[PDB]
Amino acid sequence: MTPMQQKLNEVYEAVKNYTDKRGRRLSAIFLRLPSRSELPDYYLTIKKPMDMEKIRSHMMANKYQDIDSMVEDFVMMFNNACTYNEPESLIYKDALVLHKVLLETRRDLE
């Protein structure tokens, strides 16, 4: 695997694997967004749906030319979560924390 592919897998795994101070894996809610059949209202609040399974499949299909492209999908996903849920909710706070982890991970790989 190229250094580019190694950095992509590392960024993805940092987000996926992060746990909080009590061991809770924050990424669990962001793996699979329910379909529009199951969750119509989300697809009207949210222009471009995104979840980690989609990011993972783009990564296995090498569709990421650089790291910036992967971060954009992650930031899109976390912005989506912070649009659909209110700031006081757990999912909003989990999105904010994983967003910070994402950027700190990209920075550490600079």
Ligand X SMILES: CC(C)(C)OC(=O)N1CCN(c2cc(-c3ccccc3O)nnc2N)CC1
Binding site for ligand X (CB under 6 A): 29-30, 33-34, 38-39, 51, 77, 80-81, 84-85, 91
Residues linked to residue 19 through DSSP beta bridges, in sequence order: 25
**Ordered alpha helix ranges (H), 1-110:** 3-17, 40-45, 52-60, 67-84, 90-108
- Angle, helices 3-17/67-84, rounded to nearest 10 degrees: 20
In the complex with ligand X, which residue's Cβ is closer, 67 or 91? 91
CB of 67 to ligand X, least distance (A): 20
CB of 19 to ligand X, least distance (A): 18
Task: Specify whether the CB–CB gap between 26 and 43 falls below 8 A.
Answer: no
**Measured in Å, how far apart are the chain's first and last C-alpha atoms?**
18
Residue number with the shortest CB distance to ligand X? Answer: 81
In the complex with ligand X, which residue's Cβ is closer, 38 or 110? 38
In the complex with ligand X, which residue's Cβ is closer, 53 or 109? 53
In the complex with ligand X, which residue's Cβ is closer, 9 or 79? 79
